[PDB]
Write a protein that binds this ligand. Structure first.
Ligand SMILES: CCCCCCCCC(=O)NCCCCCCCC(N)=O
Length: 336
């Protein structure tokens, strides 16, 4: 079995859809080499897609795992509902549970893995659906406690707090959705998000201000995507109806809806408490999700393995071989 990363439209995997909780979900499905050990479900974040797991998918297949990597709500071939309540962490966790059980049966279990917003999804999925999740891991995204209060992010950052998330104000508003439309702008956006730079070192993205629109036309080739990977992201994002980023950006519009869900759990539901084997892979150079943010995370876990790779936010690809090894060795211990 060939273990190198997926290429665009790689024939080693299948590309399918299923109706899941009223929505069409598209996904990558890779079948195990050998008798199946487990089914692994992998969950990307923003602005990624299932292909963001292209280093992990064939690796995990070669280890004996069936792999299901959906394009998440809003992305590529998956529906983008207009109703923001579909985008909450609880509703998307329920989508993941139904999709998982459509492969493993209602009584089955999965290994669950996430990155970025997907990392937040998978911790919530393990909390909402402990019947289903046998082991869970996240790259970059630490646990965050159940919301006990709702405060507008504008007020939080105006008091000088959570300043690494201030870019979420721009993303939640109209500017990015209105300006990044069509394949020409999508192409410049992805050159920016995957590290391309301008003639005087201009960056296309900052955690303080979000997308730097006025440098996008000067951004050069991204070091973290090759030319056909970049065009694949453009083509797949162009599957969404214009404005193409409405779906992905809806992940920034749910702070109040998620707070409503989680204030109820903070007062009446069970505590945030993970009894199943868990792994957290921090990324040293992620400015949006810095390792120090994982502070007192260990207190919420019976069995948390920690790792840290020296990589940017795009650790799944930039450090794909290292992340694969960390996951495989942890999974081997967790399952054995
Ligand atoms: C822990 C609190 C709850 C989870 C919050 C997760 C926030 C996810 C998110 O907003 N990710 C977007 C980052 C932007 C990529 C940066 C590209 C530029 C580059 N790295 O080259």
């Amino acid at each position: 079995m060939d273990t190198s990363k997926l290429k665009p439209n790689d024939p080693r995997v299948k590309y399918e859809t299923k109706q899941i909780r009223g929505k069409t979900y598209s996904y990558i499905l890779g079948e195990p080499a050998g008798p199946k050990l487990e089914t692994v479900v992998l969950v990307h974040g923003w602005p990624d897609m299932a292909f963001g797991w292209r280093h992990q998918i064939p690796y995990l297949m070669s280890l004996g795992f069936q792999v299901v990597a959906p394009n998440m709500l809003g992305y590529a071939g998956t529906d983008a509902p207009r109703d923001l309540s579909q985008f909450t962490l609880k509703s998307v966790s329920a989508d993941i549970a139904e999709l998982a059980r459509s492969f493993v049966g209602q009584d089955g279990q999965i290994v669950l893995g996430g990155h970025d917003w997907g990392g937040a999804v998978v911790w919530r999925t393990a909390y909402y659906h402990p019947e289903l999740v046998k082991a869970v891991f996240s790259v970059c995204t630490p646990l965050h406690p159940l919301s006990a209060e709702y405060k507008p992010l504008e007020d939080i950052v105006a008091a000088g707090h959570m300043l690494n998330f201030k870019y979420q104000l721009q993303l939640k508003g109209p500017d990015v959705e209105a300006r990044i439309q069509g394949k020409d702008m999508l192409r410049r956006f992805f050159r920016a998000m995957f590290g391309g730079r301008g003639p005087n070192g201009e960056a296309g993205f900052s955690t303080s201000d979000g997308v730097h629109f006025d440098v996008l036309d000067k951004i050069g080739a991204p070091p973290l995507l090759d030319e056909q990977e970049l065009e694949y992201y453009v083509e797949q994002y162009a599957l969404q109806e214009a404005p193409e980023l409405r779906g992905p950006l809806n992940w920034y519009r749910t702070r109040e809806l998620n707070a409503k869900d989680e204030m109820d759990r903070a007062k009446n539901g069970p505590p945030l408490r993970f009894e199943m084997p868990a792994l957290f892979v921090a990324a040293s150079k992620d400015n949006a999700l810095p390792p120090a943010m994982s502070k007192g995370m260990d207190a919420f876990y019976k069995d948390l393995t920690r790792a840290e790779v020296d990589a940017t936010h795009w650790a799944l690809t930039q450090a794909g071989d290292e992340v694969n090894r960390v996951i495989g060795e942890w999974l081997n211990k967790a399952l054995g």
